[PDB]
Amino acid sequence: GKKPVKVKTPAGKEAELVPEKVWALAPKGRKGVKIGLFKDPETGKYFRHKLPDDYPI
Template sequence: MSSKKSVKVKTPSGKEVELVPEKAWVLAPKGRKGVKIGLFKDPESGKYFRHKLPDDYPV
């Protein structure tokens, strides 16, 4: 499933924090190289948001 590797992301409130994604997946069009997306939870507001993950992140 998702590993416990933290990623530095910018939250919707504008702060940069290190968070662990709750879920990670690859988003790719047919026949093309995709990007890795992670689902994060903002620690302040509790809202969920998506952010691009590094290419070397294990999915």
């Protein structure tokens, strides 16, 4: 989990954050998505957010 991602925080804001952890979330038979774990700087809360389909895992 290295390169920053443009994400929409729960607080409301657009923000360029670096995920703590990234991984692929896909069922058998389907493409699924890539997901990042992030900490909202506005609140310290944790939240998850889709990554672009070519974000490196």
